[PDB]
Subunit: 247 residues, 3 copies
């Protein structure tokens, strides 16, 4: 046989490159997943991740209460935290024994898979009673925020998109929903009559995940990296795997 | 300048009226929200509210168990309440130590925003195992109940719609879902191929809220009124804000 | 009058047969329900049931965590079970004090109502972090598993469809979603523009149920049988009610 790495008959190397390329491309086909992650960062260094994976379109919608830190199997000040909520829903509406709940997120990072079309991203960032803009009567139900997403890149390939915002002020008390649509450069509408019932099924079939990791280190080591997910850490370091035309 | 309140050049007054009118009208445009609230009233005077706000269409679906009173951070008889559930799902199926659980709702009020089309309202009022009419084989999945909705009015303007029903009998053990569609007097179908994927995203983007208030007083003062929401209290008093062509 | 059971003027018998037949047929009309059940079987003999009932299409999507046994009002080792989860999401990622959590399901049975079209059934069986096939980049979002469904029959009539799989190995740690579409032998697409907004409402109106029964006996006696639901027990015994052209 020819010698490895010296001619066009290194079929092992050609198959390696094709295997990676096909992964990249399959995900971007209409058969492929689109995924979103919402990361909520707490003052104790812990991080809640919420992930949804679906065909065609994907999104996550959470209440104010759902985004607050919850330590499974530990004490969570749960009566006092009911009261915090009451005081957040209406000023002076509660009887809490603290000024600022350390369970409130300090920041949020939204990440989409590279299979989203960024122009389709929509976000409803509401207040703590789930109203997008002060009063329902004047609320648009979402903002198209794609322009603010940064490309997460590795080895010059886009591995995902990130939108990050801090909530460092006392008044940053939010509800949040986000949604994006899988790329579709074709003229075949996935929601056209021929395929609409499959998009309806996709609502049922989407897989969801949530978990609280104790540190960004643990999130990177045991959630982002092992699953080849895209990420951007507090130091602006990019995580993910470049696959297109690569060994 | 002209004197306030004496001519057509009180631009401050014209802008005030337009600001209110635009709020009213924006909500009724296809860009605007449609909202629903389900209120579950307990014997202790407390009230669970569940709210969803979305574009195009909106709804809420809850189990029997989800509608039972839950006091956050307090004792809830949780083992005995598992047994109550078993005895509600099948007669004599449980081992509870009470005849009637005071956590069961005594009544339900469904309220829609004035942006719903009442003719589109649908309700699935099921039994405690989530079957709409005794057996699935003979169940229609919903009833169109719009005819029963009362107009909540303020200053002669419709600020919302209410459907209220008591559950005063031992056998009133329910699951409940409701749904309504945003008004659309046009011939542009929001679910037509051109816009269908946006309705799909709206499923992701809808913002949800739930909370238990200790009294209808507290609900009115700290939830209904501050958010300019429509409501009808036990005395048939109407709450909400009239906006159309008003200062 | 004629004597019972001796001529074509036993109108009571004709009405009995029609009453049963109409139940069978109504469910199979486009007005009728389609239902799905997911049963998760635990080592202690208990069974979680999750049911959804809807028009047009139906499905259930659960996380790894949601499928683990939870005993309401009893001790559930909840801190240790947080750690089990961490060790399931990533090998050696947790600090649990057990090798195998007895809360993990040992098997799953998926049952659809006889109103589903089996060819439309789709399943996303993911790993414990909700990825269908190792990495999102190479995951198809579902498999069409209809071929594997067995017909549950009674008195020669199909009363439902079952797909059963054991999870007897340590590595059988799953997330799961399933979806099926109501039969529609017509050329009227329920998701066509004329009716699409009703399918959107059906997402809101679907009724859901979940409960943990302590034994398959209790599940059969107090959940399957009283509601005329189809089922297949560990002995391959079929449950349900034959209705078509029957008294
Ligand atoms: Cl494609
Ligand atoms: Cl409009
Ligand atoms: Cl029909
Ligand atoms: Pd503590
Ligand atoms: Pd700032
Ligand atoms: Pd949906
Ligand atoms: Pd979680
Ligand atoms: Pd770096
Ligand atoms: Pd108590
Ligand atoms: Pd009555
Ligand atoms: Pd939907
Ligand atoms: Pd709640
Ligand atoms: Pd009054
Ligand atoms: Pd224990
Ligand atoms: Pd095996
Ligand atoms: Pd849906
Ligand atoms: Pd449950
Ligand atoms: Pd048998």
């Amino acid at each position: 046989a020819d010698v490895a790495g010296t001619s066009n008959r290194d079929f092992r190397g050609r198959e390696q490159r094709l295997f990676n390329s096909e992964q990249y491309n399959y995900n971007n086909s209409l058969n492929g997943e689109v995924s979103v992650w919402v990361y909520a960062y707490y003052s104790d260094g812990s991080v809640l991740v919420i992930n949804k994976n679906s065909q065609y379109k994907v999104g996550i919608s959470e209440t104010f209460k759902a985004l607050k830190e919850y330590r499974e199997g530990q004490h969570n000040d749960s009566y006092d935290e009911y009261e915090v909520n009451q005081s957040i829903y209406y000023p002076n509406g509660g009887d809490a024994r603290k000024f600022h709940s350390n369970a409130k997120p300090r920041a949020i990072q939204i990440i989409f898979s590279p299979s989203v079309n960024v122009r389709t991203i929509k976000m409803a960032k509401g207040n703590a009673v789930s109203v997008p803009d002060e009063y329902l009567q004047r609320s648009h139900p979402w903002e198209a925020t794609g322009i603010k997403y940064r490309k997460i890149k590795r080895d010059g390939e886009i591995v995902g998109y990130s939108h990050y915002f801090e909530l460092p002020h006392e008044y940053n008390s939010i509800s949040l929903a986000v949604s994006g649509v899988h790329k579709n450069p074709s003229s075949y509408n996935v929601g056209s009559a021929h395929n609409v019932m499959d998009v309806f099924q996709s609502c049922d079939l989407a897989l969801r995940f949530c978990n609280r990791y104790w540190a960004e280190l643990e999130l990177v080591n045991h959630y982002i990296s092992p699953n080849a997910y895209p990420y951007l850490d507090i130091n602006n370091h990019s995580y993910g795997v470049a696959l297109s035309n690569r060994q």
